[PDB]
Amino acid sequence: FRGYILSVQAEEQKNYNNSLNGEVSVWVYAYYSDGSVLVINKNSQYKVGISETFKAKPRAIQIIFSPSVNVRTIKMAKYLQRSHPWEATGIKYKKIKRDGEIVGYSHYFELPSISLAVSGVHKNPSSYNVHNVMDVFQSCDLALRFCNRYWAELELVNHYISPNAYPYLDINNHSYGVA
Amino acid sequence: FRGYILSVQAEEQKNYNNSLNGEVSVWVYAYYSDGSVLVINKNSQYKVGISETFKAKPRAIQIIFSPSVNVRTIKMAKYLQRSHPWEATGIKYKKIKRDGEIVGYSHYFELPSISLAVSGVHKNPSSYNVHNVMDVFQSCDLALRFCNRYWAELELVNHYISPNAYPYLDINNHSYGVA
Amino acid sequence: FRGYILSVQAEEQKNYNNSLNGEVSVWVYAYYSDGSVLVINKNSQYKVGISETFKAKPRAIQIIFSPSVNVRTIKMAKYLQRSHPWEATGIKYKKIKRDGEIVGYSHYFELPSISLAVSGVHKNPSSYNVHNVMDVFQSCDLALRFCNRYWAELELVNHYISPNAYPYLDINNHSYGVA
C-alpha cells in the first residue's frame, strides 16, 4: 500500500540524517534597518560553521541550526588582552516545531556593523570519537556556502524559506518548516 | 657527466613529490558561454580542496588534480532533508599522459550558475596515519589560492598552461604537461 | 588596597592568555607605494593563520604575532614540480618589547603583487597533545578576521595601533604595545 511505504521511508530519512552521513546545516539571518534581510547558509558533514562581517544598518540577528546539531556544542564569537574566545550559547536556542516535531533551533538577538562566527557539531554520539580525522578535514573542503539578499521578510519567506522547506521563525513568531 | 646527473635529479624530484612533503594541487576550469575560461588553482600539503560558486553563462567544468592525489579519495559536492554530502567520483577521472607518464587526472562534465566543491588526499600511504594532526591544521592555513580569467582557451593554453608546465586537456583533446 | 589587587589581576591575565583558552593573534601589514597601509588581523584559539593576495603597488610586508605564539611553529608560504610547501621562518622574528616585556614578534621584509600565507601554533605545551580534535575544528570556524586600509602609517598608528593596545614597530623602529 502506498500509505505504508511512505511512512517507513520517513523513518529511514530520520535515521540517515541522524547518522554521521547526515548533514549539519546553519543559517544566519541579518535583519537590516531598511527591512531587507541577508541570509548566509552553510551545509557540511560532521560539523558546520559561519564566519562573516555584516557591514553597511544591520539591527538584529537570527541563527538557525538543523535538528542534527548537538545544541550543547554550539559556540559563538563576536581589548584583545582580556577576551574569551567564544561563548557556549546553546541554552539560548529555542526549538522550532512543526506538527509537534523539532524542525530547527533558533537564537534571535537584537544589536545595540558586527563581526560574528558560530559553530556546531553533529548530534551523533560518535562525533567525539575521531571515522578518520582525514574524513573530517575533507568535510571542511566540501562544505557549500550560499548567500543572498531579499527585499523584505515576506519575500524571503515566500521565495527562500517556503519553496526550500527550510525551518524559520518570522517577526510575528510564526514558525515554518516541514515535519 | 651532465647527462647522468640530470636523470638522477629527476628521480629525486619524483620521490620528493610522492613524499608527504610534496604538494597536492587542484585546478577547476569553468568554461563560459562567451568562450572565456575561469580557472581556480589551490596547492597545499597533505590534502587540498576548492569550494566556489560560478555565477553569471558557465556551460561545463573540468577538474584536474596533480599526480600526487589518491584518486580513490576524491570527493565532490554540488531538498536538504534528502541529499548525500558528496559523491566519490574518482572512477570518472581520466589520466593525462605525456611521454607515457601521468601528469594529471581530469574530470570533465557539461552543465544542463553552479556551486561546487571538490577534495582529494595525498597518495602517500602514511596519509591516513595522523606526522601530527596539528601539522595538517597548519597546512590548511598555508594553502595558496589563485584565480584568473582568460579571454579564450587558446590564451589560457599559451599564457597559463604552457609557461607554467601545468597538466591540461583542451577542447580538441590535446594533452599538455611535462613528464 | 587597590594597588595590590591590580598587580595580581595582571598575573591572572598572563596565566589565562598562556593557557590553551588564550587566543593566538596574527597581523599582516602590507606597505604600499603610495604610503598607505593595509592590515589583515585574525584571532583564534589553539592556532591561527592568514592566507591572502595583495594586488594593485605593495612594497614590503610586516607580520606580527601575539606573545602566545610558539615562534618555532611559525611557517610561511609565498615551478610547481619543484617547490617546498612552506619555510620555517621563526628565527627571522624580532621581539617587540615594552617596559622589558615581550608584547609581540615581528618579521619585516621588503618585496623585489604577492600571495602569502603564514601560520603559528599556541605556545602551550599541551598544543601537540590533541582537548579533543573536534574542539580544534570548531576553533577554525570561530576565528574572526578584520581587514582595513589606512591612508598613512601615522593614521594606522594613532587610530588602529594605539587605541586598541596592539603591538607594532613603525618605519622609525619605534615600538608600540602595552606591558
Curated annotation (Swiss-Prot), chains A, B, C:
Pfam family, one: Cypo_polyhedrin
Protein name: Polyhedrin
Lineage: Viruses, Riboviria, Orthornavirae, Duplornaviricota, Resentoviricetes
InterPro entries: Cypo_polyhedrin_Cypovirus1
Further information: The sequence of strain H is shown.
Function: Major component of the virus occlusion bodies, which are large proteinaceous structures (polyhedra), that protect the virus from the outside environment for extended periods until they are ingested by insect larvae.
Compartments (UniProt record): Host cytoplasm
Broad class of where this protein is predominantly found: host cell
Keyword NAD listed: no
Disulfide bonds, paired cysteine numbers: none
Domain of life: Viruses
Glycosylation: residue positions: N17, N173
Organism from which the protein derives: Bombyx mori cytoplasmic polyhedrosis virus (BmCPV)
Keyword Glycoprotein: yes
Keywords: Glycoprotein, Host cytoplasm, Late protein, Signal, Viral occlusion body
Entry GO CC: host cell cytoplasm; viral occlusion body
